[PDB]
């Protein structure tokens, strides 16, 4: 009898649904007089109205039904919100359940607390309109549309008993990130993971246009959602008496299929991809609000979004209509004299930790356990001489990630857009394979590593790929993202959303516990110009990350394999940061030992003693490199200068942590003025060789005393197709161009070095001519190693 509902409990469900809508309008409009004891007056209304109403009836409608289902079956839900502007619906339900009062004691369940609850919403010094981190039981901000469904799957990536209900707006569903995210049901594993129940709020209207998915036929819509792999269920109408029975029946129908699918998967009798249940709602937008106000339809139309009436203070007629709107819910029976909800509402509310707004999964920092990782020195390569031994840097990282997977079989996952095999990370394929959960052929078995059980996710859409990871970290787990640098502009919008969440959670919100860090690995940098990716790769993703504050994002550019392992080991321990690691796939030199890499990453920036020419004397020039390809050119430039100018004294500085360049005033993590002056001399010129746009270094080191003597060579532009050496010539980061620049800046080499500067220009022209004749660099260029 779960599908059917008793008539008596339907009134209590409707009473909860009315109370949620009453509180929703109250915080949108009312500033004082919460219970309408006295007649409404303009001083009780907020001056500026930024709340959103269009999604509020739908979210409150689903939420109360879920509380009914969570009482009987003793489930656990999260309720990630799609539209994101339906926060009044969530906060009203959180207040009714008592969760909001416990989190915020000021908003007590009383008449005075109700006045404070309405006052704080959409107000200066108060909670925001969207689903902010201050909102209890929320992981998805929802301000940017299209990432809600991916966050639903990410929260259930390793929780078997968890159930996630994601409400999808029809205006949101046409977005590119949400169009692909439906296919994520295939990669979800029913045996070891929870079930996500998507709900489509097909209200029919956007802010100003009819929705695309409501203006298609019912047959075409059913065809479309069958192709996505979901079992479609349709709930239509606008009569609450009909809608309560139908929607409760459909919810009971879907959850039993969800339990049937999970039980069949864990039993192993049905090892195949099932069509997951899904619910479609055709309820009109704002169907519990005013119908017609100014001669136009305000219910079930685009006019129902965020504004029932434009002006209330100016026009007393609208205020009278507003007062009648609040009276339509009959608030007198819903609340007592004290202002608390009546005993009918208290009984039907979930009790204890089972409350969806109080689920520990949403506040994943409490659920988070520290990652158990082995020592990286076991997987580090051995270097007898720095700069003379050549080995690929991807293999040590792949082995290290494999060891973490075995030691952390549940709370760790790896994400890659078909570049895990490309980036030579096949070491993790030894123990675990990628998860596909589809039809397989024996040709696939020999070729690709695919299985139903796996810890590596695979999809080309980086939108849904990063959406899985962001929710995975906010749930309390740990993850790692590896991709090309060329396609990092795709996730540009999503990173800013996640950086916004961490910034508010760390500072403004006090009850939010810290979650794991966001580790993004960028491979195949713009300098090598690999076969994949467009010809004009852009390293501009590093710049937009630096636009975010240094207290939420960290950028690391390790030169070699050992320094890559130390960065990867250190970043897996951090909590409230976004870690961007830029390493190159191609085989390179190795400069640091396993022990020396740890010391280097501890400081972040340090002098390389073997590369440095003279110690105990003031250097004539400071040569600095940041990336790994440009580090080789910086080292090769040092070899040429030391060969042709024996008396020249060169200090070599390598920077791994970019934000160390920022002064100590900007952030405590940055180097102090005395520390910076020790590394880079106060007066001698600095020849910085930066991977990426050369101006980014000037932004960080602007406040430094020696900024005027800082010279940066970096990425400027790329030709259609170029050799690795001649691409550096175009951007003037080649070994010869750096050596030319050092001659110019050093005061006593501008006259002595004229012959050498002429010789270097001959080498530039000679190598370019050989590149045009043969198409490949000279053998002594590719096989270069540190002379001394």
Ligand X SMILES: Cc1ncc(C[n+]2csc(CCOP(=O)(O)OP(=O)(O)O)c2C)c(N)n1
Site for a copy of itself in 411-430 (CB under 8 A): 418-422
- Count the residues of the shown chain that bind Mg ion, applying the rule CB under 5 A: 3
By CB under 5 A, residue 171 contacts Mg ion: yes
Q: Contact between 158 and ligand X (CB under 6 A)?
A: no
Residue numbers 468-497 binding ligand X by CB under 6 A: 487, 490
**CB-count burial class (<10 Å; 0-12, 13-18, 19+) for 94:** buried
x/- binding map, residues 519-548, to a copy of itself, per CB under 8 A? Answer: ----------x-xxxxxx-x-x--xx--x-
Q: Which of residues 656-685 bind ligand X (CB under 6 A)?
A: none
Point out which span in 128-136, 163-171, 231-239, 468-476 binds Mg ion (CB under 5 A): 163-171
Task: Name which position in 46, 68, 201, 455 contacts ligand X (CB under 6 A).
Answer: 201
DSSP-derived pairing of the beta strands 478-484 and 518-523: parallel
What tokens were used for 712?
């940066």
* Residues in contact with ligand X, shown as a per-residue x/- string from 62 to 101 under the rule CB under 6 A: ---------------------x-x----------------
Assess 171 for contact with ligand X (CB under 6 A).
yes
- The 8 Å CB, 24+ separation contacts for 754-757 are 756/644, 756/645
Q: Which residues are 450's β-sheet partners?
A: 434
d(CA 452, CA 454): 6
Residue whose CB is less far from ligand X, 229 or 533: 533
Using alpha carbons, select from 279, 192, 193 the residue that is nearest to residue 230.
279
Give the distance, in angstroms, between the CA of residue 140 and the centroid of all CA atoms in the same chain. 10
What are the tokens at 423?
A: 């980036």
Q: Residues 379, 404: contact at Cβ < 8 Å?
A: no
List the interface residues with a copy of itself, window 115-144 (CB under 8 A): 122-130, 132, 134, 141, 143-144
Binding ligand X (rule: CB under 6 A), the pick from 5, 35, 96, 145 is 145
Burial of 503 (0-12, 13-18, 19+ CB in 10 A): middle
Site string for a copy of itself, 460-499 (x = CB under 8 A): xx-xx----------------------x-xx-xx--xx--
Q: Does 446 bind a copy of itself (CB under 8 A)?
A: yes
> Whole-number minimum distance, CB 177 to a copy of itself, in Å?
5
DSSP character for 30? B
Main-chain phi, psi angles of 760, to 5 degrees: -65, -40
Residue written as token pair 């078909």: 418
Give the whole-angstrom CA distance, residue 53 versus residue 24.
8
Determine the size of the site formed for a copy of itself (CB under 8 A).
Answer: 122
Other CB atoms closer than 10 Å to residue 651's CB: what's the count?
26
| 703 contributes a contact to a copy of itself by CB under 8 A | no
Q: Which 540-559 positions form the footprint of ligand X (CB under 6 A)? A: none
User: Cβ distance 231 to 257 under 8 Å?
Assistant: yes
Helix or strand run (H / E) with residue 781: helix 779-782
Q: What x/- string results for residues 699 through 728 when contact with ligand X is judged by CB under 6 A?
A: ------------------------------
Tokens 């110009």, located at residue:
529
Among the residue ranges 69-77, 140-148, 254-262, 502-510, the one whose residues contact ligand X (CB under 6 A) = 140-148
User: Of ligand X, Mg ion, a copy of itself, none, which one does residue 663 interact with (CB within 5 to 8 Å by kind)?
Assistant: none
Which residues, 25 to 84, sit near a copy of itself by CB under 8 A? 31, 46-48, 50-52, 84
Contacts 24+ apart (CB under 8 A), 711-719: 711/685, 711/686, 711/687, 711/741, 711/745, 712/688, 713/687, 713/688, 713/689, 713/737, 713/738, 713/741, 714/630, 714/689, 714/690, 715/526, 715/527, 715/539, 715/691, 718/526, 718/529, 718/535, 718/536, 718/537
Contacts with ligand X by CB under 6 A: the residue count is: 26
Helix (H) or strand (E) holding 93: helix 87-97
If contact means CB under 5 to 8 A according to the sort of partner, which of a copy of itself, Mg ion, ligand X, none does residue 693 touch?
a copy of itself
Instruction: Name which position in 723, 736, 742, 784 contacts a copy of itself (CB under 8 A).
Output: 723
Determine if 525 is a binding residue for ligand X (CB under 6 A).
no
Q: How far is the CB of 734 from a copy of itself (least distance, A)?
A: 15
The DSSP code sequence of 620-654 is: SEEEEE-SSHHHHHHHHHHHHHHHH-TT--EEEEE
Q: Which of residues 382-421 bind ligand X (CB under 6 A)?
A: 417-418
514 binds, among ligand X, Mg ion, a copy of itself, none (CB under 5 to 8 A by kind): none
Q: Which stretch binds ligand X (CB under 6 A): 14-22, 169-177, 360-368, 672-680?
A: 169-177
When the beta carbons of 227 and 747 are compared against a copy of itself, the nearer one is 227
Q: For residue 432, what are the contacts with CB-CB under 8 A and spacing of at least 6?
A: 402, 405, 453, 454, 455, 456
Task: Give me the least distance between CB of 454 and a copy of itself, in Å please.
Answer: 12
Q: Give the nearer residue to Mg ion in terms of CB position, either 170 or 560.
A: 170
Cβ-contact 413, 465 below 8 angstroms: no
CB of 462 to a copy of itself, least distance (A): 8
What is the CB neighbour count within 10 angstroms for residue 443? 8
- Identify any residues that bridge with 198 across adjacent strands, giving them in sequence order: 166
Which region among 167-175, 324-332, 405-413, 666-674 touches Mg ion (by CB under 5 A)?
167-175
CB of 199 to Mg ion, least distance (A): 13
Residues numbered 174 to 203 that lie near Mg ion (CB under 5 A) are: 203
When asked if residue 95 is in the footprint of a copy of itself (CB under 8 A), the reply is no
Binding test (CB under 6 A) with ligand X, winner from 51, 54, 190, 559: 54
Answer whether 181's CB lies under 8 Å from 172's CB: no
Closest CA to 541 of 494, 608, 474, 606: 494
Residue 769 Cβ vs ligand X, minimum distance, rounded to whole Å: 32
Q: Is residue 57 within the footprint of Mg ion (CB under 5 A)?
A: no
Among residues 160, 210, 360, 533, the one that binds ligand X under rule CB under 6 A: 533
Radius of gyration of the chain (CA): 30
Distance (Å, whole) CA 54 – CA 24 = 11
In angstroms, give the least distance from the CB of 447 to ligand X.
14
Query: Measuring CA to CA, which residue among 647, 592, 653, 655 is closest to residue 614?
Result: 647
**Strand residues in 387-534 grouped as ranges (E):** 390-391, 412-416, 434-435, 450-451, 456-458, 478-484, 518-523
Of the candidate spans 100-108, 166-174, 390-398, 679-687, the one that interacts with ligand X by CB under 6 A turns out to be 166-174
Q: Which stretch binds Mg ion (CB under 5 A): 166-174, 320-328, 624-632, 776-784?
A: 166-174
Rounded-to-integer distance, Cα 776 and Cα 725, Å:
9
The full DSSP string for 127-171 is --SS--TTSTT-----SSTT-HHHHHHHHTSS-SS-EEEEEEEHH
Question: Binding of a copy of itself at residue 175 (CB under 8 A)?
Answer: yes
- Which is nearer to Mg ion, 203 or 301 (by Cβ)? 203
- Contact pick of 58, 171, 387, 558 for a copy of itself (by CB under 8 A): 171
Least distance to ligand X, CB of residue 234, Å: 16
Binding at 83: pick from Mg ion, a copy of itself, ligand X, none (beta carbon under 5-8 Å per type): ligand X
584 binds, among a copy of itself, ligand X, Mg ion, none (CB under 5 to 8 A by kind): none
Options 20-28, 402-410, 444-452, 649-657: segment touching a copy of itself (CB under 8 A): 444-452
CA distance 570 to 566: 6
The footprint of Mg ion (CB under 5 A) covers 170-171, 203
Binding residues for ligand X, per CB under 6 A? 54-55, 83, 85, 144-146, 169-172, 175, 201, 203, 206-207, 211, 285, 305, 417-418, 460, 487, 490, 532-533
């Amino acid at each position: 009898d779960i599908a059917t509902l008793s008539p008596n409990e339907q009134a209590a469900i409707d009473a909860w649904w009315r109370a949620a809508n009453y509180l929703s309008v109250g915080q949108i409009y009312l500033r004082d007089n919460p219970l309408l004891q006295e007649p409404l007056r303009p001083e009780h209304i907020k001056q500026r109205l930024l709340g959103h109403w269009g999604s509020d009836p739908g979210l409150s409608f689903v939420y109360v039904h879920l509380n009914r289902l969570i009482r009987r079956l003793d489930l656990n839900l999260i309720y990630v919100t799609g539209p994101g502007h339906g926060a009044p619906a969530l906060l009203a339900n959180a207040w009714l359940e008592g969760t909001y009062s416990e989190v915020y004691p000021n908003c007590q369940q009383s008449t005075a607390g109700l006045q404070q609850f309405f006052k704080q919403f959409s107000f200066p010094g108060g909670i925001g309109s969207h689903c902010t981190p201050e909102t209890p039981g929320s992981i998805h901000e929802g301000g940017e549309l299209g990432y809600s469904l991916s966050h639903a799957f990410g929260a259930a990536l390793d929780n078997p008993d968890l159930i996630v209900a994601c409400v999808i707006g029809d205006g949101e569903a046409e977005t590119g990130p949400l169009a692909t995210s439906w296919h994520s049901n295939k990669f979800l594993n029913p045996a070891q993971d929870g079930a996500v129940l998507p709900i489509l709020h097909l209200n029919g209207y956007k802010i100003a246009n009819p929705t695309l998915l409501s203006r298609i036929s019912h047959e075409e819509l059913r065809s479309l959602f069958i192709g996505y792999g979901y079992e479609p269920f349709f709930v239509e109408g606008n009569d609450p008496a009909i809608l309560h029975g139908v929607m409760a029946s459909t919810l009971a129908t879907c959850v039993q299929k969800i339990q049937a699918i999970q039980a069949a998967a864990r039993s192993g009798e049905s090892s195949d991809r099932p069509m997951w249940p899904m619910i479609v709602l055709r309820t009109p937008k704002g169907w519990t609000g005013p119908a017609t106000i100014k001669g136009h339809v305000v219910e079930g139309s685009w006019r129902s979004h965020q504004v029932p009436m434009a002006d209330v203070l100016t026009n007393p007629e609208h205020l009278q209509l507003l007062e009648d709107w609040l009276r339509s819910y009959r608030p007198e029976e819903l609340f007592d004299a004290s202002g608390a909800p009546v005993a009918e509402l208290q009984a039907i509310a979930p009790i204890g930790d089972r409350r969806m707004s109080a689920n520990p999964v949403t506040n994943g920092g409490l659920l988070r356990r520290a990652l158990t990782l082995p020592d990286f020195r076991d997987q580090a390569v051995s270097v007898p001489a720095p700069g003379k031994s050549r080995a690929d840097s991807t293999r040590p990282l792949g082995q290290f990630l494999r060891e973490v997977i075995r030691h952390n079989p549940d709370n760790f996952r790896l994400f890659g857009p078909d570049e895990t095999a490309s980036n030579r990370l096949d070491a993790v394929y030894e123990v675990t394979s990628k998860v596909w959960l589809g039809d397989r052929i024996p040709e696939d078995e020999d070729g690709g590593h695919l299985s139903d059980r796996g810890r590596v996710m695979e999809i080309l859409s980086e939108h849904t790929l990063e959406g899985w990871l962001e929710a995975y970290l906010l749930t309390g787990r740990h993850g790692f993202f590896a991709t090309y640098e060329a396609f990092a502009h795709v996730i540009d919008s999503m990173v800013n959303q996640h950086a916004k969440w961490l910034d508010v959670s760390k500072r403004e919100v006090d009850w939010r516990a810290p979650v794991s860090s966001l580790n993004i690995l960028l491979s195949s940098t713009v300098w090598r110009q690999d076969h994949n990716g467009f010809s004009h790769q852009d390293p501009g993703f590093i710049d937009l990350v630096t636009n975010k504050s240094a207290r939420v994002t960290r950028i690391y550019l390790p030169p070699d394999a050992n320094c890559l392992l130390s960065v990867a080991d250190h970043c897996l321990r951090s909590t409230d940061y976004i870690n961007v690691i830029v390493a190159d796939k191609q085989s390179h030199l190795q400069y640091l030992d396993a022990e020396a890499a740890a010391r280097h990453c501890a400081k972040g920036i340090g002098i390389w003693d073997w590369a440095s020419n003279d110690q105990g004397a003031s250097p004539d020039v400071v040569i600095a490199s940041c990336g790994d390809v440009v580090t080789l050119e910086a080292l090769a430039a040092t070899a040429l200068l030391r060969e042709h100018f024996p008396d020249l004294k060169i200090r070599f500085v390598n920077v791994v942590d970019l934000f160390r360049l920022q002064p100590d005033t900007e952030h405590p993590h940055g180097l102090s003025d005395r520390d910076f002056d020790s590394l880079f001399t106060v007066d001698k010129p600095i020849i910085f060789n930066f991977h990426g746009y050369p101006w980014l270094i000037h932004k960080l080191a602007y406040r430094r005393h020696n900024h005027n003597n800082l010279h940066v060579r970096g990425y400027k532009e790329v030709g259609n197709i170029n050799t690795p050496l001649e691409l550096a010539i175009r951007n003037q980061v080649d070994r010869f161009n750096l050596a030319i620049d050092v001659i110019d800046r050093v005061p006593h080499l501008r006259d002595r070095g004229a012959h050498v500067k002429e010789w270097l220009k001959d080498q530039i022209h000679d190598h370019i001519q050989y590149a045009y004749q043969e198409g490949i660099d000279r053998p002594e260029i590719n096989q270069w190693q540190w002379p001394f």
